[model samples]
Every structure is written in C-alpha cells, then in structure tokens.
Target: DDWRCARSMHEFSAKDIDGHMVNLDKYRGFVCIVTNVASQCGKTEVNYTQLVDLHARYAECGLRILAFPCNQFGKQEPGSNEEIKEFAAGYNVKFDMFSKICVNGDDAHPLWKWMKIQPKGKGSSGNAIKWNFTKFLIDKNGCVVKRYGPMEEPLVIEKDLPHYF
Candidate 1:
C-alpha cells in the first residue's frame, strides 16, 4: 500500500474541561458537529440555544456537538475552564465542552488543524476559520461533511442532518 490515505476526524484527540484527554475516535459511529466556541461572543446566545436544541433533538439519534472554547477571537472567552463550564450551564447546554484551544494559526489544536484543511463546499477558500463559532460537521464514518462559517445558524444546517440520522 504505497498510497497515502485520507485523514479523518478520528485521528485526533482533545482535552476535556477537566483536563483529561478524550479521543475523538470514541465518537466514530456518531455524527459530530465540532465548533470553536466563545462564551462572551455576541453570537453566543443564539448559537448556544440552537446548538442545545439540535443536541436535544438528535442526541439519541447519533448526533454529537463537540464545543471547544477559544479566546483567540476578540479575547472574548477569557474565562477559566470552570467559569466557561458555568457559563454554558446558564444556557442549559448539554453537549460536550472541551478545554480552550486556538482554532487558527500555529498554535491551533491538532484536530482543528486537521479539520481546517478538509474541503468545505463549492468555491471554498483556505482552511483558516474566520471567527468564533466556526463549525465543522463530521459524519458517522468520521469524515468531515462540511464547514460552516460563524454566521451560519445551526438550524440552517439541520436541513442536511436528517440524511445523516
């Protein structure tokens, strides 16, 4: 086998809010929507609400939303992991929240760096994500299905979700 195989989301791992390493491969059979989140961003309320709604609606149906808090954008999420967890609690968020990590530049997390290079859609540009709330949707087979920009609503993406479920 001289061919180089395509990489998938399964090859990455991230630390949980508690600082314990969690493997992305454990989610192999589930559809995942990974997002770079910021608790203090202006988009916070709606994004969290819709994400929680989606999680509640499809959680038992093989959907998982992995949220990673980042402070790179606007220095918006400067809270400690505990404070970030508390902020999410206010919104009744039930999805998995990972520890803070940069989602762009040299210090980006391994999983995020890998995700950046994956194809998003037609007429897509480079892999660098623009701001907080950028999302990457991965299918049950561990492949990235699409990438959503900061303004893309969760409900807007829901239209394509049924096919995966």
Candidate 2:
C-alpha cells in the first residue's frame, strides 16, 4: 500500500497553547482553516481581527480554525507559547492555537510538510510558504481543499465558505 494514500489533517497531532497534545481527529466532522500565524507582522492586526470575526460568524454552523504561531518568518513572533495565547486572548479568539512550529525548511511540522505536497484548489502546491498566515481550508473529511496565501484575509476566504458549511 502507498504510505501517503491516507494523508489528511486527522493524521496529525499538535500541542496546544496549554501544552496538551490535541489530535486532529477530534476535528473530523467540521470544516477547518489551518493556518500559520505570527504576532508582530504587519498583517497581524488585520488578520487577527478578521479571523476572530470570521470564527464568531460561522462557528455555530461548524466552522473551526487551527492557528499555529511561527517565529521562523522575519522573527515576528518572539513570545513564549503562553504569551501567544495571551495575545489571542485580547482578540477574544475562540479558535484553537497551537504551539510554535516550523512551516518551512527541514524543520517543518509533519502536517505542514504533507500539506505542501497536496495540490491547491486552483493549482499545484508550493515548496515553501512565503510568509505568515498561510491558510489551508480542510473539508469535514480532513483532506486539504484549498490553500490561501498570507495576504488573503479571513474575510476574503469567507466568500468561499458557504458551500462548505
């Protein structure tokens, strides 16, 4: 059998802000937005604002977001995992936040590494994420359905969600 035959979000697990291991399997039945987030980037304010609002707007209908903090880009996120949670707290964010992880290079997280190999909805995938807030929309089945660049705001992505929710 092919080793990659069953690749999906459900195959990965990440540590939450509280350092507890959370299996992606728990998100099996909901559509999800899995993204790499940063604290000090120029897009941080706008991104976080829209994300909080987007989640609030669609969560009741089964939308879920998984945000992972990464300092690998521009050294933007310089806080501890606790501080990351604290920053999200200010936005009243209800989406899940994961511990910092690499989304590029030899150190990339397994989930991200696998995701990069999956094709984007519009075209093929990239070898590396160019910047922070790179988002991937996953179907209820845990398979990657779409990938959005750093500049694509949550509200912009919202336009494509009604069909999935």
Candidate 3:
C-alpha cells in the first residue's frame, strides 16, 4: 500500500476477506464509512447490526461501509480470516469486510495511519484509534468529514449522513 499516502481514499487498496485485492479507487464518488472493527468487542452487536442497517438504508444513495477487522484492542478480534468471516456471517454483515489489520503502532496498515492524521471529530484529536469500532466518514471527494469514537452508534451518525448525498 504505498498508495495510502496519495491523499485520497481512492488511492488505497486492501485485501478482501477471501484474499482478493480490492482497489478502494473503485469506490470513487461514493460516500464511504470506514471503521476498524472487531469480532469480540463489547460493541459488537450495536456496531455490526447498525452498520448493516446503515448500509441497507443508504447504500443506494452511494454510501458504502468498509470494515477492517482489528485485534489490537484487548485482542477482541483474535481469530483467523476464516473465523472472522464466520463471526461476521453470524451478524449478517452485508458491507465490505476486509482482512485483519492493525490500526495503531508501527505495523498498522498504511490506510489506517493515513486516516488517523486527518482532523479529528468532536473531542478527538489524537492519532491513535482509542478502540475498536472507531469510524471515519469520508465524503464523495475522498476527504474525511468526521471521526467517531468507539462508543458512537451508527444510528447517531446516521443523522448527519444526508448532507453528503
């Protein structure tokens, strides 16, 4: 992912859960909600179900949710790719779910590192992701418009989604 430094979400690529490479550029012109997710996090049900709902509700309006499984927070997502797939399947997650990645530390994925540096949202201004389910909402032009803490519910974010469409 040298493409992560390109200053736009369109310049990134990530591996799908099935090991296929997905070019984020294909989602150009789409309102994207990117989140670092976990299979065993305390916010699992709320985050996953709400994400699924949000996708269902606004997908036709060019909204897309891209979830990156991360285990860095308390090892909450300690599972192989296949295992994680099974876990997400249980939640009926319909949005994109990518391979596991680190959202903090030196080994963090390049895209995540790039995302962390954008202007923060609300009271958040730090680079490190506080916990799993932290979200970044990108506008159609690929600029980050908002960042949400792990505790922020998808429905709560949903209220602000209309402006982007």
Candidate 4:
C-alpha cells in the first residue's frame, strides 16, 4: 500500500540510559506519542515536564510517550544519550527516552519517514517537519493519528488527547 499510516510504524532497537535494549513493540496497545526532543533547547523544560505530567496522568490509562533526543538541529542536544538521560532524570521523567537520531535528511531516521508522511496540520501530508520537538501521535493500532509542529505547544495536543482515550 502507498499509504504510510497503513504500514506498521518502523521498528528499531535502541539503548536506554542504562544501555539496555529497549524494544519499540513494548509501546503497542497504548497511544504512542513520539517526539524529536532536545536537551539544551529553550523548550526542553516545558516539553519534558508536560510529557512527565501527561504520562503520570494517563499512563495507567494507556498513554505512552516515546521521546527521541536529537542534536541534528542547532546542536541543541549535544549531550550523549547518557547525559540526556541525566537531564531527564533531574526532572523525574517517567516516559521512555530513545537513542538520539536525526529526523531529516538522507540520514533521517526511519521513524521520521513514518511521521513526515502522516497527515500534516489542516492539509495534505508533507514530509517536511519544520523543526525539533515535532511530534506524531499514534493510536493503539499503530496508525499515525496527528502530527504537531515544533511551535505548537504540547498542551495543545494534551487538550485533544482525551478524545482518543
């Protein structure tokens, strides 16, 4: 099928803070929230905290956030995966954090392929992702639900998320 959403979201094995293999399939059956986040960026704190709060509120209700750190933009996340882990730990984050990756370019991660082809804001699908922290909301069935740009606040998504639950 030419439809990307109908295709299974790419599956990859990446290490967590402790270098343990974390399987992407572990998030199945939960609404998956995927984002390309940065540790040194200005939006870091809000993104991290809101995600943590969102997780605390809905994790038991089946909401799972998969945050992927990336330094591909402005080098905002220069820290190693371990350092990024420390930063998130400082904030008591409970969501899953994956290895850092580039979200655009020939080297763009496969995850981005799934996200960019998803329906864009109020229009047809577009591969361009605007910037860092761009997120893709995936339903329990593994279909991309919505894509939010970096400028859009996380709360904006939070407001609309309950409809799915």
Q: Rank the candidates by lDDT, best first.
A: 2, 3, 1, 4
lDDT of 2 by residue, 24-90 (tens): 9999989999989999999999899998998999999899999999999999999999999999999
Where does candidate 3 stray beyond 4 Å?
1-5, 120-125
Q: What's model 2's lDDT at 153?
A: 83
Clashing pairs in 4: none
Summarize candidate 4's per-residue lDDT along 44-155 as a digit string, tens digits. Answer: 8888887888888888888988888888878899988888888889989888888787777776766665567655322234466666788788877666788877777677
- Ranked by TM-score from best down, the candidates are 3, 2, 1, 4
The weakest ten consecutive residues by lDDT in model 3 span 118-127
RMSD of each: 2.9, 2.2, 2.0, 2.9
Per-residue lDDT value at 165 in model 1: 65
Q: Show model 1 residue runs off by greater than 4 Å.
A: 1-6, 121-123
Q: Residue by residue across 1-165, what tens digits does model 1's lDDT show?
A: 111144777877899988999988989999999998998889999899999999999999999999999999999999999999999999898889999999877788877777776665211566677888988889987787888889898888888887776
Task: Give the per-residue lDDT of model 3 (tens digit) for 93-117.
Answer: 8889899998888888877878877
TM-score of each model, paired residue for residue: 0.92, 0.93, 0.93, 0.86
| lDDT for predicted candidate 4 compared with the true structure | 0.75
3 versus 4: better TM-score goes to: 3
lDDT of each: 0.84, 0.86, 0.86, 0.75
Q: What's the number of clashes in each of the models?
A: 0, 0, 0, 0
Give the TM-score comparing model 3 with the true structure, all chains together: 0.93
- Which of candidates 2 and 4 is the stronger one according to lDDT? 2
